[PDB]
């Protein structure tokens, strides 16, 4: 009868106030978890902020070494210009040497011919002087030998 | 009809209770959404970190490659500098060979000129001598033979 109807509402009202205790326990554990998670996510957010700046710093250091590389290259470039100009100057000097040598030779040849002509002129003139000297004296001797023939 | 009011309490409570059992079933589904979205953000945040750490690490590797390019290419500058010195030496030798040839050419051409002058003096001295004597001998000879003939 009703004794079986209240013995039911008994077991039911029990499990209800029972599972209400379990829900309250459920909810105090989820309060505790979401609070520890809010304090953890705060940490991961900060390690990330740090990572980011870290990576951005690594970038700057890379770029900075590139800038140094591109300056080196700019200098190695001036060395190649310089080497090029020394080589060109060398080439020019060499052909100048060649040319001057060839001129030396030629002028040296012309000096020789000149000296040959000079020598011949001097010898020819010398022969003349030697000849005239003896012959003129030979005239003066022949006249002397007549004068002195009758000197008493 | 007094206990009928007690069944108005119970009825009314089994509705306020059946109602907060539905506000819960909804609350819990709204929370299992948040938590699912947090899991999302969390996998995303973890992804960025991974990419960050990887991009950062590839940059470190590239940095060391870059440094190696600097060292390698800086050897080719030690050689460039040794060359510039050698070509600078080859150039001073040549500038001297030129200085010396230019000198020799000036002298050898001086010698030529002088030999040409001496030759012109020499020919002039001789031909003046020959001309003068020729004239003086003519008169002396004629007048002697004016007499050698007036003998007969």
From Swiss-Prot, chain B:
It is found in: Cytoplasm; Cytoplasm, Cytoskeleton, Microtubule organizing center, Centrosome, Centriole; Golgi apparatus membrane; Cell projection, Bleb. It comes from the Eukaryota. The modification N6-acetyllysine is found at residue 107. Detected in blood platelets. Autophosphorylated on serine and threonine residues. Cleaved by caspase-3 during apoptosis. This leads to constitutive activation of the kinase and membrane blebbing. Protein kinase which is a key regulator of the actin cytoskeleton and cell polarity. Involved in regulation of smooth muscle contraction, actin cytoskeleton organization, stress fiber and focal adhesion formation, neurite retraction, cell adhesion and motility via phosphorylation of DAPK3, GFAP, LIMK1, LIMK2, MYL9/MLC2, TPPP, PFN1 and PPP1R12A. Phosphorylates FHOD1 and acts synergistically with it to promote SRC-dependent non-apoptotic plasma membrane blebbing. Phosphorylates JIP3 and regulates the recruitment of JNK to JIP3 upon UVB-induced stress. Homodimer. Interacts with RHOB, RHOC, MYLC2B and PTEN. Interacts with ITGB1BP1 (via N-terminus and PTB domain). Interacts with RHOA (activated by GTP), CHORDC1, DAPK3, GEM, JIP3, RHOE, PPP1R12A, PFN1, LIMK1, LIMK2 and TSG101. Interacts with FHOD1 in a Src-dependent manner. Interacts with SHROOM3. Belongs to the protein kinase superfamily. AGC Ser/Thr protein kinase family. The C-terminal auto-inhibitory domain interferes with kinase activity. RHOA binding leads to a conformation change and activation of the kinase. Truncated ROCK1 is constitutively activated. This is Rho-associated protein kinase 1. It comes from Homo sapiens (Human).
């Amino acid at each position: 009868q009703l004794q079986k109807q209240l013995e039911e509402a008994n077991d039911l009202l029990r499990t209800e106030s029972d599972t209400a205790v379990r829900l309250r326990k459920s909810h105090t554990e989820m309060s505790k978890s979401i609070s520890q998670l809010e304090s953890l996510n705060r940490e991961l957010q900060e390690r990330n902020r740090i990572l980011e700046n870290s990576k951005s710093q690594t970038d700057k250091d890379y770029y900075q070494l590139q800038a140094i590389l591109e300056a080196e290259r700019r200098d190695r470039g001036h060395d190649s210009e310089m080497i090029g100009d020394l080589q060109a100057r060398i080439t020019s000097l060499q052909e100048e040497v060649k040319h001057l040598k060839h001129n030396l030779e030629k002028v040296e040849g012309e000096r020789k011919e000149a000296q040959d002509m000079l020598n011949h002129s001097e010898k020819e003139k010398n022969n003349l002087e030697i000849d005239l000297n003896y012959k003129l004296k030979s005239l003066q001797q022949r006249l002397e030998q007549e004068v002195n023939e009758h000197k008493v």
